[PDB]
């Protein structure tokens, strides 16, 4: 995976370089000499993460621009997968935001402590003397704690009164909440909570844009540095402003920079959400609604110029059920068909609302956003394949099989695919009976066309014909390797991770290294 390695190494370099660079820009130069004695080394430790966060804060919103990335795919296979790790990149970039935010916050806790301590004559003489600046006219403070409130109440006062402190507290709460509600448990069991509380990025970014507006972290100005030679003027602080050589130094603060970094990504994400709104408005007529047993309804629907590839999924917004939310459902229909369909299991409040609106128990207004997902158009490339689906993961394989029949009837000569072995791993066929009917149908079409050998499928019950218990992968791989010698076998699976590791192990173990042997090529959804 050289491309994603390289992105992470450029990204991590451009964080390490920024850390070291904005560390040394606030540590070495004599512009920050006086501020580095009031704040010590904890100044640069606070400002290097600031620039690192500036860079990471653009890099978070970009990969989650799903409509812009849809347009970029439209403008456009391993590299396609690598650029489909946008969510993984988002995750790690947000995690390193958390790291650098922790460093920034800790260093600023040190800064606030040492800026209240010096203000109340509880530090070394020089820092206390430096905190005295800014009290009177014609002098700019260096210590941003101005009221003589003793610690630890003084630090709290600065937090609840300084704009930087208030915004930092707010956006740190809004970041911790995002992180804690973006654990796999919430992102996979209560995705409603994840998506709602993950919309604190707006508050995070609004607070972050105005975070550095006060310019409290101040360094000595260029003109002051020109008139105020520090190596001469450091030890004569008690008489500053009272000799020719040493005027009172003037400290200004660096103008806010974060907005310059983040407006591009925020503009791009708002554009993304406007494309999503437009996809919402784009009309989608629901041609037919079959309700397969055990509370699953399939929506045959037609939208203006909708193109899709096998294995892709669409988000379905129903304004009547829910105005804000988008619910993804795997496309279960072949690209050739005029209508694109999805099967929805009625397991929750939004699907139940769609069920009631459809009238299965007039039709609801639904909106379709994007044929997103990783295209599985390479299934047809190989001469033999092993389609494996467990539980709910079998759904995209339905669309794959439907498209296989269309490629067999339309061309029958350009179909590189020759053989299907399908394995379905469900506790019971209690929610996917339509898929069972699908497999019976495809077997029937193969038998009627005098090509019954095309599709072989077995159903296994964890709790051809259905079987009990998990399949013996060792024996199955050996059997089909004996069946097909010196040909590539593409193994496709959508299911548990342990199952994926199992299939990887058997694929490597049963594959022959030489080109004159059988190669088992595993692909995982």
């Amino acid at each position, epitope marked *: 995976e050289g491309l994603s390695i390289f992105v992470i190494l450029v990204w991590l370099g451009l964080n390490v370089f920024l850390f070291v660079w904005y560390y040394r820009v606030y540590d070495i130069p004599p512009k920050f000499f006086y501020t580095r004695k009031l704040l010590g080394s904890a100044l640069a430790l606070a400002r290097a993460p600031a620039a690192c966060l500036n860079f990471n804060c653009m890099l978070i919103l970009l990969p989650v621009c799903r409509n812009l990335l849809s347009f970029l795919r439209g403008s456009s296979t391993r590299v396609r997968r690598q650029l489909d790790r946008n969510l993984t990149f988002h995750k790690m970039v947000a995690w390193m935001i958390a790291l650098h935010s922790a460093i920034h916050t800790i260093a600023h806790l040190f800064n606030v402590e040492w800026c209240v301590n010096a203000r109340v004559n509880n530090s070394d003489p020089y820092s206390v003397a430096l905190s*005295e600046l800014g*009290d009177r*006219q014609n002098e700019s403070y260096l210590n941003f704690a101005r009221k003589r409130i003793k610690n630890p109440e003084g630090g709290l006062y600065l937090a609840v009164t300084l704009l930087a402190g208030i915004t930092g507290v707010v956006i740190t709460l809004c970041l911790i909440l995002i992180i804690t509600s973006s654990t796999k448990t919430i992102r996979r069991s209560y995705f409603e909570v994840f998506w709602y509380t993950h919309h604190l990025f707006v508050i995070f970014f609004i607070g972050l844009a105005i975070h550095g507006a006060e310019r409290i972290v101040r360094g000595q100005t260029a003109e002051s540095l020109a008139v105020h030679n520090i190596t001469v003027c450091e030890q004569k*602080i008690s*008489e*500053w*402003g*009272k000799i*020719k050589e040493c005027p009172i130094p003037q400290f200004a603060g660096n103008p806010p920079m974060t907005w310059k970094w983040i407006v591009g990504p925020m503009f791009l994400y708002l554009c993304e959400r406007l494309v999503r709104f437009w996809r919402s408005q784009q009309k989608v007529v629901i041609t037919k609604v079959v309700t397969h047993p055990f509370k699953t309804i399939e929506l045959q629907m037609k939208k203006k110029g909708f193109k899709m590839e096998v294995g892709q999924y669409i988000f379905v917004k129903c304004p009547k059920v829910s105005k804000l939310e988008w619910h993804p459902f795997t496309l279960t229909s072949a690209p050739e068909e005029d209508f694109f369909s999805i099967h929805i299991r009625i397991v929750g409040d939004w699907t139940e609302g769609l069920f009631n609106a459809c009238g299965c128990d007039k039709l609801p207004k639904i909106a379709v956003d994007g044929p997103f997902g990783t295209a599985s158009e390479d299934v047809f490339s190989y001469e033999v394949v092993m389609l494996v689906g467990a539980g709910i993961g079998v759904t995209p394989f339905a669309s794959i099989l439907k498209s296989v029949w269309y490629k067999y009837c339309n061309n029958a000569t350009n179909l590189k695919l020759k053989k299907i072995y399908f394995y379905w791993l469900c506790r019971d066929t209690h929610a996917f009976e339509w898929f069972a009917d699908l497999l019976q149908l495809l077997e029937s079409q193969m038998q009627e066309r005098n090509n019954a050998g095309f599709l072989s499928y077995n159903i296994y019950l964890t709790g051809q014909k259905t079987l009990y218990g998990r399949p013996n992968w060792d024996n199955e791989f050996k059997t089909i390797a004996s069946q097909h010698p010196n040909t590539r076998i593409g193994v496709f699976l959508c299911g548990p991770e342990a199952l994926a590791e199992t299939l990887s192990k058997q694929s490597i173990s049963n594959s022959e290294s030489g080109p004159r042997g059988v190669h088992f090529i595993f692909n995982k959804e």
Partner: antibody
Amino acid sequence: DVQLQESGPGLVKPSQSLSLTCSVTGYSLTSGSFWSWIRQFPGNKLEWMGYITYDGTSHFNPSLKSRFSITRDTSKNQFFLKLNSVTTEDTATYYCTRDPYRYDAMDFWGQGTSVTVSS
Amino acid sequence: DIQLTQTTSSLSASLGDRVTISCRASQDISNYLNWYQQKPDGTVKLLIYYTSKLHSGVPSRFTASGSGRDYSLAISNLEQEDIATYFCQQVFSLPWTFGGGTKLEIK
């Protein structure tokens, strides 16, 4: 060390102009300090009159309208008080002082000159 | 102009007795108050600046302390050279207003 003498007319007439000289010996005005002219009225009531900085900048008490001004003779190492249109209330003991601290404290004061205004 | 008021216009005490001279500023001054001692012959000399910093050269018995508006000068043990008027001056905002003064009379 540094010592300040005030020298000037001890009895000016009302509506005249008062001109007081402060001679500094152990320090030069251009080397650096704020050189004030605090005066004490009868009844022991001090008020900051106005200072001239080392750079030559001079700042006045606004209670003194525009009737008060400070100049200096750096060659002779001395600075001067100049009150236009002196009134009867201008009678006071004028102390010329040196202010070398960033805390604006007058460490060295003069002995003072008692200026009287009467007809 | 900020008005510095010394409530004690005149105070009496004995030798070797603690005396406190307190003055209050009409507006908050950021510890920017200085203390001067004017001898009866009119010689003024700085005692403390910034409300705590003892001017190099005056006896250690002069200790001053205060915050915000209220400031005080304390002398531990009195002798005959402490007969003098004591002024508190701000330097926080121009004009640098002085205090009323406080004469010390030994009993």
